[PDB]
Structure formats: structure tokens, C-alpha cells
Design a protein around this ligand. Structure first.
Ligand SMILES: [Ca+2]
Ligand SMILES: [Cl-]
Length: 76
């Protein structure tokens, strides 16, 4: 199973994952790849912010699904 993590700046990271992987595990992989701390990452799928303790299967994320990645909105 691969999924795509897509930024709004046109960069897509391809990750190898399992349905039982948690969002924490996915964020850890994004940190390894791009150096973004997990607490700064916002992942969105199905219009939902994905939470660290839930699994890909919890959100019904499928093979070759794309997840949006943006940063946490700071500075307000
Ligand atoms: Ca895995
Ligand atoms: Cl999808």
C-alpha cells in the first residue's frame, strides 16, 4: 500500500504504509523525509484533520489515496 502526501506547494511525498499504521507513524515518516516536526504537521483527508492515535483504516484511507499536508496556522 502506497499513499501520497501532497502539499499545496506542489510537492508530493509517496509513503509505504499499512492500514493499521497510525497517523503518528505517518507524521514520523514525513518528519524523516522533510524535517517538519509532527506537532507542526496538519494532515487532512475526507475534510477531517487526522489525529495521531487513529489508523489509516479508521479514516478509510485507501491504496493510492492522497492526504493533504499543510502547516499548523501560527501567528494569529
Ligand atoms: Ca508500516
Ligand atoms: Cl481517496
Amino acid at each position: 500500500m502506497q499513499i501520497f502526501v501532497k502539499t499545496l506547494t506542489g510537492k508530493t511525498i509517496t509513503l509505504e504504509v499499512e492500514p493499521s499504521d497510525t497517523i503518528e507513524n505517518v507524521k514520523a515518516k514525513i518528519q524523516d523525509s522533510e524535517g517538519i516536526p509532527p506537532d507542526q504537521q496538519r494532515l487532512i483527508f475526507a475534510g477531517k484533520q487526522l489525529e495521531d492515535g487513529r489508523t489509516l483504516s479508521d479514516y478509510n484511507i485507501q491504496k493510492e489515496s492522497t492526504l493533504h499536508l499543510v502547516l499548523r496556522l501560527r501567528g494569529g
